[PDB]
Subunit: 102 residues, 6 copies
């Protein structure tokens, strides 16, 4: 997108949820002086790309075409139980098994 | 319901308990021009969906038709580490032996 | 007392200490319009039932009628080093051992 | 003690360190209307008893008669890396060995 | 580097995201009275050495020459589920294997 | 120490990084009433002894005579993801290995 402040850097921390950040990506767009085509594009390309790898891995898992409502339901668990319950055990139970890796 | 800010996005944080969020859902509802029925429908359909996979996993667990008194009570340990006394110990002990999942 | 803001909903949080809730419950009772016996009925009836599973499980353990000095201390362990150093960490081996559960 | 607020209940949270609370206990003493000796008695009896089982277990370990400088330095470890590193690990391997407990 | 309060110690906290700190590194460069060449130099020379081993280890992961955009995406992995779940799931299970180490 | 607030004992919280505690140790030295030599004498001794057992052990571990700059980078690695990744990884199996301890 490249529009100042609004999308070149609007990013989601790790504790910052996918839900709170989308506003950081929207409310901030309101600040950029862009055309609606300039913004809507910014919501498709830069949203998924510059936002929280816990969830980007979910945005490419759900994959494109997911409405934000889809990236919303799944990336809601970003957090200690929803995601982290599944994130700690995936690496923990994988490498333990590292003699054989699927 | 699709009413501004409340049912379009009122949400429950992964650290935010079933109570703080319930206050929000109830609060921004006072911000949308809504009748008594406008809000009663808004509670059942969105609260369960747009709210923290922890409580959301409990609300379905409660079985629809359970008064909020129950969504409150069951989702009380919902919590920062609270509910999770059951969430981490399971994910950490079901996947742990080899591959057996029950 | 079924008093507004004070009992019907006063509730201790998960990340929350027995203190601040006890303070919430206490501090607000003056705020309700009740009779003296009523309030006393709340300190004994609600304070245990509507507060923080790390600690509620304790209150039910030390038991009703136990001096607050006793409730306090045990529930002051709630919170990382006191209650936490013990329980899930033990829950790891309770379900690992799940073939046999005592 | 019984002097209003200061020593009847001044308590140390679980995550709250020995210094943050000791400060509460001290400062709150300045506010009570106690004789010089009243307060002196209070610093001893209530500082060790109503303060965070992590540090309280330490104050008992150091042994009564230790100056606060000693209670302080020792209790500073209360916290995740210094005190928690030790108890989680010990509680974990002490009971794992459960057939034999020393 | 040694320029006024910018590079003397601008350091990323262990829990401070790369993103949050880097600003303290940027705006401070803006905040000092340096020449344009000094600051450009201060970016590469100083941002990596003084930036939180979680990310200072990532800046090693990208491999020098990566545009900061790469440092941004990569260090965005700094965080609990992405970078902490890897050091928690890796370091714990590696040394466990200490009979044999690769 | 004995100078006001600064060196009598200035202390670091567990989560308090070397940037939240030491910074205090710095800003506060400008306030303590010390001779130019005093402060130089106090910046060495008190800084290492009264600060965060993780980092305190680091400052002693690098070995005296190291520049503080050498203690700063070296103590910026205090922290859960960074520092706890290393000690959490070891303490758990250090004792598991208790049949043989090296
Ligand atoms: O900082 P501590 O006193 O050592 O304890 C913390 C704290 O728990 P408390 O609610 O009891 O204060 C965190 O709470 P937050 O303020 O981060 O919400 C909790 O977080 P979670 O509920 O999200 O798990 C965290 O756990 P973690 O470091 O896994 O985020 C847990 O630390 P311990 O599990 O290490 O005791
Ligand atoms: C090993 C130790 C650090 C001590 C430990 C173990 C596991 C717990 C908790 C389980 N548990 C235990 C006591 C009190 C509560 C409270 F206060 F939070 F309700 C609670 O949930 N379950 C976490 C919830 C959570 C969140 C994110 C990552 C891991 C876990 C496990 C906390 C601490």
């Amino acid at each position: 997108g490249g529009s100042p402040t609004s999308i070149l850097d609007i990013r989601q921390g790790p504790k910052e949820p996918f839900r709170d950040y989308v506003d950081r990506f929207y409310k901030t767009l309101r600040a950029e002086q862009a055309s609606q085509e300039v913004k809507n594009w910014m919501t498709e390309t830069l949203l998924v790309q510059n936002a929280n790898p816990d969830c980007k891995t979910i945005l490419k898992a759900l994959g494109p075409g997911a409405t934000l409502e889809e990236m919303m339901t799944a990336c809601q668990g970003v957090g200690g139980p929803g995601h982290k319950a599944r994130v700690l055990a995936e690496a923990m139970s994988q490498v333990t098994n590292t003699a054989t890796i699927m």
